[PDB]
Amino acid sequence: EVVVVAKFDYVAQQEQELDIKKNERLWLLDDSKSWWRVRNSMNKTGFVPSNYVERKN
Amino acid sequence: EVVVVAKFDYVAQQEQELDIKKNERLWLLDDSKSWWRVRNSMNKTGFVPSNYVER
């Protein structure tokens, strides 16, 4: 984990997100993947690594 | 509507992760927006958009 700095304020839109403020120092726990926000048929939401998602396109 | 499914099983490792089963229907909240996991000085963790932090 590295220390990073928030560029902008961000207001979390779901409980799995973090509220941050511009210029806040944070610890970066994982930048090795692009996580995507997903929801299933059971109405549950969360994050999965992008490569686990298939868009039929 | 673009159909989106789980490509593979993904077994969640942390509370903010979602377990998904291969071939199940999913819905994407964003257009290929990447998120990273961070922690604040009060030890709270969560995801933020990757482009919001500077390394």
Author numbering:
A (entry chain A): 5 to 61
B (entry chain C): 5 to 59
What does the publication say?
During the crystallization efforts that led to the monomeric apo- and peptide-bound Nck1-SH3.1 crystal structures, seven more structures were determined that all exhibited domain swaps, leading to dimers. The swaps are located at the exact same position in all structures (i.e. Lys-36 in the n-Src loop), clearly visible based on the high-resolution electron density. Dimers are formed by exchange of the C-terminal 25 residues, almost half of the entire SH3 domain. The interface thus generated contains a short anti-parallel β-sheet encompassing the CD3ϵ sequence 36KSWW39. Superposition of the Nck1-SH3.1 structure with the bound CD3ϵ peptide shows that domain swap and tight peptide binding are mutually exclusive. The C-terminal half of the SH3.1-binding sequence would get into steric conflict with the second SH3.1 domain in the dimer. All of the dimers are swapped in the same manner, but with different juxtapositions of the second SH3.1 domain with respect to the first. The hinge at Lys-36 provides quite a bit of flexibility that allows the dimer to pack in many different crystal lattices. Indeed, the hinge region varies over ∼6 Å within the superposed ensemble, and the distal loop covers a distance of ∼8 Å in the dimers. Given the large number of swapped, independent chains present in different crystal forms and grown under different conditions, swapping seems an intrinsic property of this SH3 domain.
